[PDB]
Structure 1
Amino acid sequence: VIAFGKFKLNLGTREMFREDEPMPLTSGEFAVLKALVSHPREPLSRDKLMNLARGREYSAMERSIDVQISRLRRMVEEDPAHPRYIQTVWGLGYVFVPD
């Protein structure tokens, strides 16, 4: 489904790879990351992410959205402090920026 940086994510099977090595995604990590990458370049509020994260499983209520973002950044970013793929939009929320 989706490639960015050294990552490949399969939205249907929940398979993720870093440099082709299999890397797991908890339910809530997966829920947040899928909401982000499925809306490329649309900044998403915490409320809208929480909402989009809801599936038929323990997903949205696993951890706070900001803690999920922080964990996803530590997984995907060379520097979590200056993120490339999971960016902050001041006033607003978070955004996936492809490539």
Structure 2
Amino acid sequence: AVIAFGKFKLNLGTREMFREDEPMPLTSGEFAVLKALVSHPREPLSRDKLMNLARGREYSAMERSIDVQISRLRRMVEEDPAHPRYIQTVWGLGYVFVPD
């Protein structure tokens, strides 16, 4: 129901997210990208696959370029974006959500 990783708790249904229980906002583009990643734990997703999975009934997949959304999301959930733990890169493939 609520995805939990690190100090985060994410509710895919309501789009509510918390950092150590303090409410944090997810723009449509961040949410669309985070949801795709989080709902496919350990499945590396190409940028194309991400873009396709991010599409919703609202303006989201077209908000920003995948890499930038990824960069933005890493700034929000990683202790060190340069060495991400949750939103990782799979060389020659794309990106992957690693749970825990």
TM-score scaled by length of structure 1: 1.00
Q: Which runs of 5+ in 2 are unaligned?
A: none
Q: Give the number of equivalent residue pairs.
A: 99
Offset at residue 46 of structure 1 (A): 0.1
User: Secondary structure at 1:83's aligned position in 2?
Assistant: coil
* Per-residue Cα deviation, 1:38-85 (whole angstroms, up to 9, x for no partner): 000000000000000000000000000000000000000000000000
Q: Distance in 1 between matches of 2:89 and 2:72?
A: 14
Offset at residue 87 of structure 1 (A): 0.2
Aligned-residue Cα RMSD (Å) equals 0.3
Q: Which runs of 5+ in 1 are unaligned?
A: none
Offset at residue 90 of structure 1 (A): 0.2
User: Secondary structure at 1:30's aligned position in 2?
Assistant: helix
TM-score scaled by length of structure 2: 0.99
Q: Could you list the runs of 4 or more consecutive aligned residues of structure 1 that deviate by over 4 angstroms after TM superposition?
A: none
Q: Distance in 1 between matches of 2:57 and 2:38?
A: 20
Q: Quote the sequence identity (%).
A: 100
